[PDB]
């Protein structure tokens, strides 16, 4: 048993079928000692007595809020959370992994030290999340994160619409020309009802760059069914663009979201000419000097 | 009255003509009390007695070093400095202001956090100066400065000459790529004879950038009296040059920033048809309107 926060404790439980339950002690936070009784939110009635309650936990019926009483009034409480370790493996059952088998996915629109992380949930009910820098050893990259929020847009995986939570984080110190010698290490704590799980990921900002889609995409007609297509760097992108430069990929649609999923032609300039004479013209952007993630496609019609 | 350094005190004297003089107390630093007499370096003979001397100061004849004695030997001394406040305005009479109302001007050759400040003096006699970071609060930009020295270069303002002092400073912790959200604040303490003044300035490194003139400026003659002029970024300029880039201005002379007609090049070489004049180039930060470099010039020669 280890304390997670004041009066909230995590009990690590071996979930192999013949495993003995862990014995824990709970102490009423009071100066008095006599005639103290205990109750539980899982069990009707009085389940014990004395200043210190010793119980054996193996199932989630042994978890939850425990409250000590004297004379009919409340004294204090402790809440027990369970962390399953089955076959030596901590449980990962709260979150749904993405198509690649990762639970945490992080993206940065630029090199300013701001990034977001997201995850999917198997059930969206009675959930709490906390994300913070892990290890906190010297020379660790300190990161400040906000609170997780629920996206209205759900993420379809196979045949189910999983709900997605995401959180924004900021590196406390940046020096953006400097090379990253150590990764950023983060941990997500996930709670659902009386279950505790936690997740970790580590990365460099250069790896998770996903620029915003190109802006102000326009069409100007030319002789011989040629059209000029032009766009600009997105406003979220790091400046100066002479140093932080983007390369673009242009695609024609006659009528699958990650860089190489479509055949297309490469241009490093913000404009090209193309002969569509019908359909759509799409463009995505990537960092020019590092093979980071690509932007979403920006598309405009080829008017006929 | 306040203490500037050990045994050196600053007295704030109102210099309006009918103002009363400040009464100040001086205490002899000794374990003895009887038969203590006082003398001054402005006033020969015994001017008082007792462990504590009370004097009234209004003029510089009431200033300088005061020394207590017992038995004909020195015991301790105190020095009095006067800070004039006339019409409610602190006196600024030690230094001469520049082209604008400022008395302090600072310049940096690059973004490394090392910079120099200079000031002018009305008279070079009995001068001492001290310059340090202002406030030095949390969230202040801590700066370490050296000792002031007399520069060999004298300057001319109006039709009169003034002598120049200069000092080198270094920011203690610098990321040169980061944007400056707060200025550097400095205070100069100026002393001349028994007179105290002090001056303050605030600036951003980006505002005081004056790059060195382009290096290795050379001229290569070509056929038909065209010549190629080329140069390099100066060795003092911040790197990488892909991030810290300079724009240049090339001028032709038959015989500083925006006083001359010249043509702009961002690359380090141009071709020019001068047949015998001079070709000059200056440099300026490409993305910020900082001060411009001194002109570097090369004679134009017709051959090849
Ligand atoms: C991810 O999940 C794992 C599994 O739960 C988790 O590991 C647990 O971490 C806690 C500490 O955060 C460990 O509990 C400690 O154990 C040591 C050794 O026995 C004790 O010294 C500690 O007690 C001290 O601190 C307590 C709290 O202040 C005090 O009550 C006490 O008096 C001591 O001062 C404490 O009990 C626990 O052993 C590990 N378990 C394992 C097997 O790793 C990990 O922290 C999670 N990661 C993140 C980033 O949340
Ligand atoms: C620029 O010049 C101005 C004008 O001379 C100057 O202002 C003066 O600053 C001094 C130093 O802060 C002030 O003198 C102090 O008065 C306060 C009143 O609250 C006292 O607390 C101070 O006492 C100190 O020393 C005592 C004895 O050791 C300690 O017991 C005590 O805790 C303090 O440490 C001290 O007497 C003075 O009042 C102002 N005058 C004004 C308001 O003009 C300014 O500081 C100069 N700036 C720089 C950067 O030099």
From Swiss-Prot, chain A:
Glycosylated residues, chain numbering: 25, 100, 110, 198
Cystine connections: 28-68
Main location: secreted
Fibronectin type-III domain residues: 211-295
Record has Protein biosynthesis as a keyword: no
Single GO MF annotation: protein heterodimerization activity
GO BP, one annotated term: cell surface receptor signaling pathway
Pfam families: IL12p40_C (PF10420)
InterPro entries registered for this protein in UniProt: FN3_dom, FN3_sf, Hematopoietin_rcpt_L_F3_CS, Ig-like_dom, Ig-like_dom_sf, Ig-like_fold, Ig_sub2, IL-12
Stored Gene3D superfamilies: Immunoglobulins
PROSITE patterns: HEMATOPO_REC_L_F3, IG_LIKE
Protein keywords: Cytokine, Disulfide bond, Glycoprotein, Immunoglobulin domain, Secreted, Signal
Protein's cellular compartments: Secreted
All copies of domain Ig-like C2-type, residue ranges: 1-84
Effect of residue 265 to L: In strain: B10.S/J and SJL/J
Keyword Signal: yes
Assembly, per entry: Heterodimer with IL12A; disulfide-linked. The heterodimer is known as interleukin IL-12. Heterodimer with IL23A; disulfide-linked. The heterodimer is known as interleukin IL-23. Also secreted as a monomer. Interacts with NBR1; this interaction promotes IL-12 secretion.
Family: Belongs to the IL-12B family.
Role: Cytokine that can act as a growth factor for activated T and NK cells, enhance the lytic activity of NK/lymphokine-activated killer cells, and stimulate the production of IFN-gamma by resting PBMC.
Protein name, entry field: Interleukin-12 subunit beta
């Amino acid at each position: 048993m280890w304390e997670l926060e004041k009066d909230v404790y995590v009990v690590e439980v071996d979930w192999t079928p013949d495993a003995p339950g862990e014995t824990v002690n709970l102490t009423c936070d009071t100066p008095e000692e006599d005639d103290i009784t205990w109750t539980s939110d899982q069990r009707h009635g009085v389940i014990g007595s004395g200043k210190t309650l010793t119980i054996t936990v193996k199932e989630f019926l042994d978890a939850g809020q425990y409250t000590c009483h004297k004379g009919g009034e409340t004294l204090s409480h402790s809440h027990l959370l369970l962390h399953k370790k089955e076959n030596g493996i901590w449980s990962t059952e709260i979150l749904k992994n993405f198509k690649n088998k990762t639970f945490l996915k992080c993206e940065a629109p630029n090199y300013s030290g701001r990034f977001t992380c997201s995850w999917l949930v198997q059930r969206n009910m009675d959930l709490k999340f906390n994300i913070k820098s892990s290890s906190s050893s010297p020379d660790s990259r300190a990161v400040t994160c906000g609170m997780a929020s629920l996206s209205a847009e759900k993420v379809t995986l196979d045949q189910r619409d999983y709900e997605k939570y995401s959180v924004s984080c900021q590196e406390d110190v940046t020096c953006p020309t400097a090379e990253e010698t150590l990764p950023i290490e983060l941990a997500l704590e996930a709670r659902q009802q009386n279950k505790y799980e936690n997740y970790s990921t580590s990365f460099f900002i250069r790896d998770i760059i996903k620029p915003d889609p190109p802006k102000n995409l326009q069409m100007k007609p030319l002789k011989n069914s040629q059209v000029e297509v032009s766009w600009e760097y997105p406003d979220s992108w790091s400046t100066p663009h002479s140093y932080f430069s983007l390369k673009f990929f242009v695609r024609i649609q006659r009528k699958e979201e990650g860089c190489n999923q479509k055949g297309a032609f490469l241009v490093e300039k913000t404009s090209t000419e193309v002969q569509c004479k019908g359909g759509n013209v799409c463009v995505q952007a990537q960092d020019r000097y590092y093979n980071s993630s690509c932007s979403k496609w920006a598309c405009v019609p080829c008017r006929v």
